[PDB]
Design a protein around this ligand. Structure first.
Ligand code: CA
Ligand code: CA
Ligand code: CA
Ligand code: CA
Ligand code: CA
Ligand code: CA
Ligand code: CA
Ligand code: CA
Length: 158
């Protein structure tokens, strides 16, 4: 358990199950190993769950969520912001996109690691706007499309 302030803070967990709350300001939150609960709150925050199964709450403002190979199975609960982003440490060639109920689900092909965006489909507030792969970026429209195409045909490398 670590708290920031209304200033811009840097919060780093350890290998246990941690709670990090940035409060207002533009914060960096890193969970490390274990199942962490990361709360950006107000401000433009940078959240990494790192290893383990992490719950990531960027909150209001435009938050950046890190994911990659070996990051386990993380869920984003967004609250608000017009330019929330996900940064993924793998090429667009190795991502898969699918809808699970109201959730958007991103898997890294042939690994275990999953990134879920809770209630993606339910309302705008819950959406993340841009996903950067290792050099490329697709937008909400591009995402909800790849989802449809990958579900229909695969034929995007089965
Ligand atoms: Ca913050
Ligand atoms: Ca802060
Ligand atoms: Ca941790
Ligand atoms: Ca973690
Ligand atoms: Ca935030
Ligand atoms: Ca946000
Ligand atoms: Ca993780
Ligand atoms: Ca958003």
């Amino acid at each position: 358990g670590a708290s920031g302030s209304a200033r811009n803070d840097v919060l780093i967990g350890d290998a246990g199950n941690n709670v990090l709350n940035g409060l207002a300001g533009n914060d960096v939150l890193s969970g490390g190993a274990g199942n962490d609960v990361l709360l950006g709150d107000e401000g433009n925050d940078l959240l990494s769950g790192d290893a383990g199964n992490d719950d990531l709450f960027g909150g209001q403002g435009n938050d950046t969520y890190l994911f990659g190979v070996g990051y386990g199975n993380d869920t984003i609960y967004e609250s608000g912001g017009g330019n929330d982003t996900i940064r993924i440490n793998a090429g667009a060639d190795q991502l898969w996109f699918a809808r699970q109920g109201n959730d958007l689900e991103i898997r890294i092909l042939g690994t275990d690691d999953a990134l879920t965006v809770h209630d993606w489909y339910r309302d705008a507030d819950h959406r993340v706007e841009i996903i950067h792969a290792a050099n490329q970026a697709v937008d909400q429209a591009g995402i909800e499309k790849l989802v449809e195409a990958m579900a229909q045909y695969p034929d995007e490398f089965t």
